[PDB]
Amino acid sequence: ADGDKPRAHLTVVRQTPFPALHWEHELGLAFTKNRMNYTNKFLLIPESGDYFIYSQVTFRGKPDSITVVITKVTDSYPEPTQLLMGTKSVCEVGSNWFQPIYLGAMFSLQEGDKLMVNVSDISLVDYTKEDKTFFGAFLL
């Protein structure tokens, strides 16, 4: 049993005032471990390597589309860099609707890189349960 590898699973909460979400990180099912830092809406990478990244956001209801982006930031570039984008057009039947949107992929990251999630529209996101909207990464 080795690792000790950095790992984090974060879950949704009521957002206060493309916007980034902020996160639960220790309560319920969320957690961070092995030097992973969740701070200031970011995941802070402690070790350069290849990570698998994910998030699902569930959206629920007059807009055109919903969109998620998981986004990397480094002080090397400080142009921020877009790793994953889920974008879906919306079908105006209700209109009490909801759609999950889910991403995950692998990326090579520098120690010190920053990760956040951004949505088209913070007021659409379902913040109510921890298993509907979340965001996670681990070192491979």
Place this chain on the structure above:
Amino acid sequence: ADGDKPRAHLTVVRQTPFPALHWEHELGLAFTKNRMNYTNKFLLIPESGDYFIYSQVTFRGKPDSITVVITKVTDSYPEPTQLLMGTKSVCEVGSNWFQPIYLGAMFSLQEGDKLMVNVSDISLVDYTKEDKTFFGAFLL
């Protein structure tokens, strides 16, 4: 080459009589290995650690929504615990429709924990091909 880590990929089959699905586990592409147990519709975790979990269910067609939950059960709690929920409202164009719904995330699990998948409606699930509905986990 180490691991020997527990790993399982399960695939869909015709369900007999929120309901849990049951699974193929050795035929075709499914499998379990390294002490993973598939029994009684559960995945039985043999080693406490962090696992990545997934399932896609494809649904196909007068209902409101479809929903998947991947769900953990322990004899510690025996309140069952909801790890992942995909829920989507349905668009009544056809109505011969179908939608895949896909989840996966990482979780810290006790050896002895139980995992199952639950759907809003067993009669909606496409059981026909193994690559449309499935469910899987591995130790990280």
Place this chain on the structure above:
Amino acid sequence: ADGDKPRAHLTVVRQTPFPALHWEHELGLAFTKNRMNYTNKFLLIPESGDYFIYSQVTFRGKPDSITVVITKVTDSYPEPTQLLMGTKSVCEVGSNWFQPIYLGAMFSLQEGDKLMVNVSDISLVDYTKEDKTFFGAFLL
């Protein structure tokens, strides 16, 4: 820090003339490493083992459905084998629409196996940004 494990993240580009997509593999965020080969629209597995596989394709707009398949080919079988299928029916509101479709699961593969992605309709795929359509795998 061990591995040295085979790993690849590939991203979308303008397709030239079920069709397989072809891929970016070194520029931007794509890459292959540790003996992984991307050639002739395939991912060529260099080591038998269990791999986690994924792809999202985003589709954008008079058709019935969209579909992705990730597909394995070996010279053992040369019947090609379907590992993952995302299929979704389409809702003809616009009709400037778009839908992401995302798969990933674990599979046991022979060294020498070949992997490709196939879609229902190459002209529907959004090729414009690298974070909308992609395809990836790593050795577990």
